[PDB]
């Protein structure tokens, strides 16, 4: 395009100085910083190099592009008309950067390592020819897993499920979207002053009581969508390890997706979104713990309705089917 830029292009000194690490994986470090008084999240991925990072080869640009494309398409839903949702993490910009890792980022990396501990290599070995993709996203808050003991009540749980269901439905309708890896580390929660959140599905607008939280979906490692019959997806048909996990219902969902799609990952099977929503519902009922339990009639009723959702939702064919037809959302 206009060639790689230096890190200073995306992260000028003041923005670098305000970086705090907030997350990691094999193929991405994520930092929070502040620009124009506003928090943002910065995801940085080393690309195109020959050598190992975090135990695996670096993605090429062509290998990571699908996930950037998916990010952008889902972000763009916030500005659409017939199918509109703000429930995917908003993408502000994408740059290809060249250079050694900024010493100021290493300081932030070290602080996270000392306090939370890292599975990753200390990123101090990259040379001045190293390419990276730097993605700036809106700040989404903290993941659901990390909020295990932090939510107010099962009313909050209902809002979260409703938000996720609406977002996935809008994406099914617009993009024939499947998330395919929507475990509780990929659902982000942040405070909102809005009492109700707004979405539009096939031209019909409606609202969701927020309970003070806004949900953002993240991580498109395994996601699938299409436009004009061009399908963007991660082909895991030859992956062995993804389907052999144990110890958590999460790992059954990979197997159940493979059963549903006959190991054909290019196809559209929006049932996979139902499977993830059931897994999240299961987490809400079994692993989340709330500050206020259902100590009244109205609250014991919400508990009952979420229990019924758990028992019935797998008989729906899509997030769209669930949103439009399930008694929980009436
Ligand atoms: C090619 O990229 C496609 C988009 O993928 C992502 C966008 C935004 C993300 C995470 C994304 O993928 C997963 C990933 O990179 N991790 C390091 C694991 C999760 C780290 N989170 C939870 C850190 C986090 C906390 N508050 C946030 N506010 C916004 N975005 C965040 C985070 N992460």
Within this chain, do residues 236 and 253 fall inside the same structural domain, yes or no?
yes
Gap between the Cα atoms of 282 and 210, Å rounded: 20
Residue ranges of the binding site for ATP: 22-30, 43, 138-143, 181-186, 219-221
With a 6 Å cutoff on the Cβ, whether 220 touches ligand 1 is: yes
Question: Which method, experimentally, gave rise to this model?
Answer: X-ray
Asked if residue 71 lies in contact with residue 140, where contact means CB atoms within 8 angstroms, the answer is: no
Residue 287: count other Cβ atoms within 10 Å of its Cβ. 13
Task: Count CA atoms within 13 Å of residue 154 on its CB side.
Answer: 23
Residue 88: count other Cβ atoms within 10 Å of its Cβ. 28
Gap between the Cα atoms of 262 and 244, Å rounded: 16
- Distance between Cα 287 and ligand 1 center (Å): 22
Within this chain, do residues 44 and 144 fall inside the same structural domain, yes or no?
no
Gap between the Cα atoms of 192 and 249, Å rounded: 30
With a 6 Å cutoff on the Cβ, whether 181 touches ligand 1 is: no
Asked if residue 19 lies in contact with residue 105, where contact means CB atoms within 8 angstroms, the answer is: yes
Task: Tell me the two tokens of residue 290.
Answer: 């709330």
Burial class (CB within 10 angstroms; exposed 0-12, middle 13-18, buried 19+) of 298: exposed
Q: Residue 63's domain spans which residues?
A: 1-139
- Distance between Cα 70 and ligand 1 center (Å): 14
Domain count for the chain: 2
Within this chain, do residues 116 and 247 fall inside the same structural domain, yes or no?
no
Within this chain, do residues 152 and 123 fall inside the same structural domain, yes or no?
no
Indicate the residue among 80, 107, 139 that finishes a domain.
139
Asked if residue 138 lies in contact with residue 92, where contact means CB atoms within 8 angstroms, the answer is: yes
Task: Tell me the two tokens of residue 205.
Answer: 């607008």
Task: Count CA atoms within 13 Å of residue 156 on its CB side.
Answer: 24
Q: Name residues whose C-beta falls within 8 Å of residue 29's C-beta, 6 or more positions apart in sequence.
A: 21, 23, 43, 44, 105, 109, 120, 123
How many residues can be counted in the chain?
330
Task: Tell me the two tokens of residue 154.
Answer: 């099962």
Q: How many whole angstroms from its chain centre is CA 229? A: 24
Q: 51 in helix, strand or coil? A: coil
Within this chain, do residues 154 and 277 fall inside the same structural domain, yes or no?
yes
Within this chain, do residues 132 and 44 fall inside the same structural domain, yes or no?
yes
Indicate the residue among 139, 163, 195 that finishes a domain.
139
Supply the angle between the helices 154-175 and 271-286 in degrees, to the nearest 10.
170
Within this chain, do residues 128 and 219 fall inside the same structural domain, yes or no?
no
Where the chain is discontinuous (C–N > 2.5 Å), the residues before each break are: none
Within this chain, do residues 96 and 187 fall inside the same structural domain, yes or no?
no
- Phi and psi for 301 in degrees, rounded to 5? -70, -45
Within this chain, do residues 114 and 254 fall inside the same structural domain, yes or no?
no
Within this chain, do residues 173 and 313 fall inside the same structural domain, yes or no?
yes
Indicate the residue among 83, 117, 139 that finishes a domain.
139
With a 6 Å cutoff on the Cβ, whether 47 touches ligand 1 is: no
Gap between the Cα atoms of 23 and 33, Å rounded: 13
From the list 259, 286, 282, 284, the residue with the least C-alpha distance to 271 is 259
Within this chain, do residues 254 and 153 fall inside the same structural domain, yes or no?
yes
Q: 314 in helix, strand or coil? A: helix
Q: What is the CATH number of the domain that holds 212?
A: 1.10.510.10
């Amino acid at each position: 395009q206009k060639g790689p830029v230096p890190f200073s292009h995306c992260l000028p000194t003041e923005k670098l100085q305000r970086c705090e690490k907030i997350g990691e994986g094999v193929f991405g470090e994520v930092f929070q910083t502040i620009a124009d008084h506003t928090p943002v999240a910065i995801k940085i991925i080393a690309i195109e190099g020959p050598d190992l990072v975090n135990g695996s080869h670096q993605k090429t640009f062509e290998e990571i592009l699908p996930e950037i494309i998916i990010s952008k398409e889902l972000s763009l839903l916030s500005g659409e008309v017939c199918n509109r949702t703000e429930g995917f993490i908003g993408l502000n910009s994408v740059h290809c950067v060249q250079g050694s890792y900024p010493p100021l980022l290493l300081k932030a990396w070290d602080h996270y390592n000392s306090t939370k501990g890292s599975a990753n290599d200390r990123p101090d070995f990259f040379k001045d020819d190293q390419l990276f993709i730097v993605l700036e996203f809106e700040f989404g808050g903290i993941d659901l897993e990390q909020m295990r003991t932090k939510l107010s009540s099962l009313a909050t749980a209902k809002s979260i499920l409703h938000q996720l269901t609406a977002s996935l439905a809008v994406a099914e309708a617009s993009l024939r979207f499947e998330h395919r890896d929507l475990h509780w580390g990929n659902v982000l929660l942040k405070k909102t002053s809005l009492k109700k959140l707004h979405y539009t599905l096939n031209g019909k607008s409606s609202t969701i009581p927020s309970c003070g939280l806004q949900v953002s979906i993240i991580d498109y490692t395994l996601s699938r969508l299409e436009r004009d019959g061009i399908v963007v997806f991660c082909d895991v048909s030859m992956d062995e390890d993804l389907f052999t996990g144990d110890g958590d219902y999460q790992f059954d969902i990979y197997r159940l997706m493979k059963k549903e799609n006959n190991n054909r990952w290019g196809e559209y099977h929006p049932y996979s979104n139902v499977l993830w929503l059931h897994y999240l519902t299961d987490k809400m009922l079994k692993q989340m713990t709330f500050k206020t339990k259902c100590n009244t009639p109205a609250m014991k009723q919400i508990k009952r309705k979420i229990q019924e959702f758990h028992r019935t939702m797998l008989n729906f064919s899509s997030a769209t089917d669930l949103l439009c037809q399930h008694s929980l959302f009436k």
